[PDB]
């Protein structure tokens, strides 16, 4: 979630050169500068007589965004005899796989063709060039004398490459032994020392290789993808390889011992032609020092909402345990035909939380099929199934799909800010894009209020301007922010305090600040990283006890803090980020003191009664009708108490009787809303316990239909309370005469 997407470092190569097909970081151990290693397998080099041999370019990140090729090989095709080209470097796809350790760079040409030492042939044995800064050697393990389709002649070594912790090169060629595939491991020191240009079939000591198998294992493509991790007791790196056509095109992943190339564990796909093993990643995702296996199946078809198979892709996450057990879960794709499991790139601890993260890309997803990359954050229980960030391709297809996300590289801090970066290569548009992770600021915000129960009678608070001595209560909010990586000590926060949250819908606001005299207050903070709770005191005063609508709804206090984003690392403005899984707001509740028994809620008992005193009215006249209504609450306080007299279509209201002291002068109104006309009269806010009301309402009735025979009223008291807020409905009938 902390990757910077607004201003990424965009790199461009020659048109049609497949620039960005392979990406990597170059971090020399003798220099403070870092470079991007971008392979362009179809680029035109300066080799004499070689067309589209491909090249690997190192790109300067500090300035000018310049990319300059690395001269692994400057000579053209060697000759076996006078007129007998020994090798064929044209269209060799050099740069299709780039790997880099501290000072070593491993670039391979899987489609490199060789004329063997026996007969004039063209065998894609594949070749690699290992550069140790000063000395560039050639590594061609599959250029041996076992040369045929049933040997290593079509091995295509360097299709997938990797580096182990013990300075070993894991090489995968999926063509060996009639396309069964092969894994070849060699020590880097042995490769450098044993190099000699005159000999082409160099035999390296201490080389670990997988042997040929039975013919029923043909066309399995072992070595299509490779990964390194530790999956047994010792510290050596074992060999994870994807075998996407194995088990009757079901797909398999072979884990081999890193010490003697012995089979360790197996993964098998659940669907055919899904390419289980197209991409393999090995990283610890739950932070317990056991490497986990991530296997992509970009062609996987799952059941949709209508039960039809849809090609969305899938990634299988297997968590390594103390024993050889693996806890396997599945991550399905989000868009059809997007090839979700195409590339899986470990990101390290992208947010410096404690668990490593991983990036999964669907290079044909998103709008216009540009490409999409998903970032998943590791948790203690595994991987979060919901991605936290979405990276979208921003370049349209020229002749071929942009394939944004076809290759990604991460887990390297290129700007020394403490967080790992991520390079994404879109070889369809010949682009390489560097995304920088932003510093994550974890904020522990608090909001303390003086006792939540507010007493309206307790009014020991002075006021400015008038000093009306009305009740008041305090609010205290504290802010502390800490984070890892490069981050200036003092961070600028602005906090806003809004009263009456969840109730502010154009209605009245009851809680007002003592000095600002406004429900909304905003204050800017300048707090330090790793500092104490910076707490400030504010005073808020309530309105008059008989001013706001009601005292039942709790007063809600809302604080919203946001980070001022002019916080740069003096590098083109890499702003920090707040933690995604933190509350950006904190809200507290304040209540009003109201005597409502021990249960803290007022539960009234509402009763209504009425007598006729006329018992008959004559049809032809406008008869004055006075109804004597008794409204009593024998329960507790009734908030916003009014009686509802729903008169029929016949009569209308005249006025309250005020000529006698036995009845009351209730404030009354005529209402017509919502298809029904009725009379309301205020009964007191609140309507106190045991209060017995008695009053009369004058009317005037004139019959509508000549056969009506009765006039029926309906009386009901209701309040805004939460329980027992309504009286039983009483219907009074007056007979027409």
């Amino acid at each position: 979630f902390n990757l910077d997407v607004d201003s990424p470092a965009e790199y461009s190569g020659p048109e049609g050169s497949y620039f960005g097909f392979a990406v990597d970081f170059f971090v020399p151990s003798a220099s403070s500068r870092m470079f991007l290693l971008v392979g362009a397998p179809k680029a035109n080099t300066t080799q004499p007589g070689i067309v589209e041999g491909g090249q690997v370019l190192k790109c300067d990140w500090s300035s000018t965004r310049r990319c300059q090729p690395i001269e692994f090989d400057a000579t053209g095709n060697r000759d076996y005899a006078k007129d007998d080209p020994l090798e064929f470097k044209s269209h060799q796809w050099f740069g299709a796989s780039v790997r880099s350790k501290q000072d070593k760079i491993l670039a391979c040409a899987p489609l490199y063709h060789w004329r063997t030492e026996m007969k004039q042939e063209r065998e894609p044995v594949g070749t690699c060039f290992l550069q140790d800064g000063t000395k560039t050697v050639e590594y061609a393990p599959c250029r041996s004398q076992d040369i045929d389709a049933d040997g290593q002649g079509f091995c295509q070594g360097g299709f997938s490459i990797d580096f182990t912790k013990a300075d070993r090169v894991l090489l995968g060629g999926p063509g060996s032994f009639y396309w069964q595939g092969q894994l070849i491991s060699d020590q880097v020191a042995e490769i450098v020392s044993k190099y000699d240009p005159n000999v082409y079939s160099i035999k390296y000591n201490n080389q670990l290789a997988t042997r040929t198998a039975q013919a029923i294992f043909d066309d399995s493509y072992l070595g299509y993808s490779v990964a390194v991790g530790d999956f047994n007791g010792d510290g050596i790196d074992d060999f994870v390889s994807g075998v996407p056509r194995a088990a009757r095109t079901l797909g398999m992943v072979y884990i081999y011992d890193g010490k003697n190339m012995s089979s360790l564990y197996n993964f098998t796909g659940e669907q055919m032609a899904a390419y289980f093993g197209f991409s393999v990643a090995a990283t610890d995702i739950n932070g317990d020092d056991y490497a986990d296996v991530f296997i992509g199946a970009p062609l996987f078809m799952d059941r949709g909402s209508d039960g039809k198979l849809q090609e969305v892709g899938q990634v299988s996450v297997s968590l390594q345990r103390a024993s050889g057990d693996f806890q396997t879960t599945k991550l399905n794709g989000f868009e059809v035909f997007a090839r979700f499991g195409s590339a899986i790139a470990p990101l390290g601890d992208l947010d410096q939380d404690g668990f490593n993260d991983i990036a999964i890309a669907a290079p044909y997803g998103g709008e216009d099929k540009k490409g999409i990359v998903y970032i998943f954050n590791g948790r203690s229980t595994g991987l979060n199934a919901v991605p936290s960030q979405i990276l979208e391709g921003q370049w349209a297809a020229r002749s071929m799909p942009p394939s944004f996300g076809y290759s990604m590289k991460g887990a390297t801090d290129i700007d020394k800010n403490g967080y790992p970066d991520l390079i994404v290569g879109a070889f369809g548009v010949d682009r390489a894009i560097l995304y920088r992770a932003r510093p994550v600021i974890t904020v522990n915000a608090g909001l303390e209020v003086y006792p939540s129960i507010l007493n309206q009678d307790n009014k020991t608070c002075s006021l400015p301007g008038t000093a009306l001595k009305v009740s008041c209560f305090n609010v205290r909010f504290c802010l502390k922010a800490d984070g890892k990586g490069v981050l200036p000590r003092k961070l600028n926060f602005q906090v806003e305090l809004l009263l009456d949250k969840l109730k502010q819908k154009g209605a009245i606001r009851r809680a007002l600040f003592l000095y600002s005299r406004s429900p909304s207050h905003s204050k800017n903070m300048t707090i330090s990283r790793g500092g104490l709770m910076q707490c400030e005191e504010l005073i808020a005063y309530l309105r008059d006890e008989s001013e706001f609508r009601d005292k039942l709804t709790p007063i809600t206090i809302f604080m919203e803090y946001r980070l001022d984003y002019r916080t740069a690392a003096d590098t083109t403005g890499l702003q920090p980020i707040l933690n995604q899984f933190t509350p950006a707001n904190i809200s507290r509740q304040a209540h009003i003191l109201l005597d409502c028994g021990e249960d803290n809620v007022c539960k009234p008992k509402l009763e209504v009664s009425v007598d006729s005193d006329q018992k008959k009215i004559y049809i032809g006249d406008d008869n004055p009708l006075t109804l004597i209504v008794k409204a009593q609450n024998q329960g507790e306080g009734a908030y916003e108490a009014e009686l509802i007299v729903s008169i029929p279509l016949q009569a209308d209201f005249i006025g309250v009787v005020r000529n006698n002291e036995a009845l009351a002068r209730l404030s009354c109104a005529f209402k017509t809303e919502n298809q029904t006309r009725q009379v309301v009269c205020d009964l007191g806010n609140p309507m106190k316990a045991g209060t017995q009301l008695l009053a009369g309402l004058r009317f005037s009735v004139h019959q509508q239909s000549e056969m009506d025979t009765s006039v029926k009223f309906d009386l009901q008291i209701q309040s805004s309370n939460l329980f027992d807020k309504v009286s039983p409905v009483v219907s009074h009938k007056v007979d027409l005469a």
């Binding site: 097909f21 269209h91 796809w93 899987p110 489609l111 063709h113 004039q120 042939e121 063209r122 894609p124 389709a149 079509f154 295509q156 299709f159 999926p174 063509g175 009639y178 396309w179 043909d218 066309d219 493509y221 299509y224 996407p244 056509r245 009757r248 095109t249 669907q271 055919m272 032609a273 390419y275 197209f278 970009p298 062609l299 078809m301 039809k308 198979l309 849809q310 090609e311 059809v336 035909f337 090839r339 044909y364 071929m400 799909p401 394939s403 076809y406 070889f427």
Partner: protein, 465 residues
């Protein structure tokens, strides 16, 4: 008693006829002035009006040609010539029956694996093609057939790119002659010439490549998406028969050959009848293949050898709507699959009306196989050869035009036969032909007298001027 006839048709005979279907007119001078001249026929008889002077034409349907629906020219819609006589503002109903007896049009495209592993199955695949043509010729009378071929993508490491003599002869290393390698070759367009199909099928020979998996899914996609090239008919059943004897290359297999561009599903077969994007586009995926097959309504059939029957059965499980058969010396399995696919063809009878007059209106009742009359519906579904369906159509005309004769054709969509009508609007009375020009008979006045009554001109508002 007083009715809509006595209130609208009292003007004259044609208007009385136009008022209502049950309005009747009296053309007898014996009827005294004051009694209604337009009323019920029973009312007119009660009013001692002469039956010969009663003009009550009843709308009716006169069938002209009613040769029965044929059974297995064939008669496919009965009746086929119905004469309609409609008085103005009247509705009349007639019944038709549509029976599907013409055989289904079927398009069969045959895909042959012409690789070197098929050297011992070439005879089997050719015999399968000939037996397919014969079986559908005996099954349906409207068969269109054609075929194509595939080997694999013509690039390294699949092709033998060395020595230079191996480009035109891939069997140079083994000292034999074979055809050059190709990706996909559309050999014969969908044609009704079964003899031509047999000759072209028998003329085929195999080619050679290196690895066991083949590029048959590329050929499947090309034959599915190149409608103009293959010759698919829109109003027909499409069967694609895929023949092979080995595993198949799938999507993402092309990265070994250097092909990283996904298949886009477009047509790439030019005038040379070759897959021009074979060396630049990756093999198609199962999802894209299924989507294209569903879009083009093509029934894929796998005619594979025994060693790959289970593999292609699982593939067909991944591709719904696909059947798998065993290719061998005898073609019984594939022929049975073809027979079942033909038997799973269901036809729909969509009623369409052409050049219907604006004044006329139609209402449709569908009596489908459920035997439940569904008003407002005109196209039953399902249906098989010989199966019959019936419709009840009621025609109503607003007033009457001056054409005095209209005709429209009722046709079922996709059916050769059709039903025509002869809508003869009465729009007037038989006694009106014997009308009297003006004055004379209508007393001393100068109005006009017809059908036993007189109707004066402007000014004269009297009964008889």
């Amino acid at each position: 008693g007083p009715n809509i006839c006595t209130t609208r048709g009292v003007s004259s005979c044609q208007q009385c006829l136009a008022v209502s279907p049950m309005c009747a007119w009296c053309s007898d001078e014996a009827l005294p002035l004051g009694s209604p001249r337009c009323d019920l026929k029973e009312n007119l008889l009660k009013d001692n009006c002469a039956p010969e002077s009663i003009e009550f034409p009843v709308s009716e349907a006169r069938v002209l040609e009613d040769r029965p629906l044929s059974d297995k020219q064939v008669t496919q819609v009965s009746p086929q010539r119905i004469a309609l006589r409609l008085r103005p503002d009247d509705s009349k109903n007639f019944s038709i029956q549509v029976r599907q007896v013409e055989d289904y049009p079927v398009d069969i495209y045959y895909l042959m694996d012409l690789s070197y592993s098929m050297k011992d199955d070439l005879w089997s695949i050719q015999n399968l093609g000939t037996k397919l043509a014969t079986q559908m010729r005996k099954l349906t009378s409207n068969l269109r057939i054609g075929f194509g071929a595939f080997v694999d993508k013509p690039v390294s490491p699949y092709m033998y790119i060395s020595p230079p003599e191996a480009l035109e002869n891939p069997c140079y290393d083994m000292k034999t002659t074979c055809l050059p390698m190709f990706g996909y070759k559309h050999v014969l367009t969908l044609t009704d010439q079964v003899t031509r199909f047999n000759e072209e099928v028998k003329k085929q020979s195999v080619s050679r490549n290196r690895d066991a998996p083949e590029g048959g899914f590329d050929a499947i996609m090309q034959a599915t998406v190149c409608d103009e090239k293959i010759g698919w008919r829109n109003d027909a059943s499409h069967l694609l028969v895929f023949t092979t004897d080995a595993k198949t290359h799938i999507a993402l297999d092309g990265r070994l050959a250097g092909i990283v561009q996904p298949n886009d599903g477009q047509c790439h077969v030019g005038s040379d009848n070759h897959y021009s994007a074979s060396t630049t586009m990756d093999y198609p995926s199962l999802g894209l293949m299924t989507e294209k097959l569903s879009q083009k309504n093509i029934n894929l059939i796998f005619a594979v050898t025994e060693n790959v029957v289970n593999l292609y059965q699982n593939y067909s499980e991944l591709i719904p709507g696909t059947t798998v058969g065993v290719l061998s010396m005898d073609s019984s399995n594939v022929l049975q699959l073809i027979v079942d696919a033909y038997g799973k063809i269901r036809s729909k009878v969509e009623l369409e009306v052409r050049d219907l007059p604006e004044e006329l209106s139609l209402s449709f009742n569908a009596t489908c196989l459920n035997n439940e009359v569904i008003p407002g519906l005109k196209s039953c579904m399902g249906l098989k050869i010989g199966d019959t369906v019936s419709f009840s159509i009621e025609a109503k005309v607003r007033g009457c035009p001056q054409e005095k004769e209209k005709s429209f054709t009722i046709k079922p969509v996709g059916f050769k036969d059709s039903l025509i009508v002869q809508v003869t609007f009465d729009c007037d009375c038989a006694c009106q032909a014997q009308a009297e020009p003006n004055s004379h008979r209508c007393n001393n006045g100068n109005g006009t007298f017809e059908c036993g009554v007189c109707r004066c001109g402007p000014g004269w508002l009297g009964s008889q001027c």
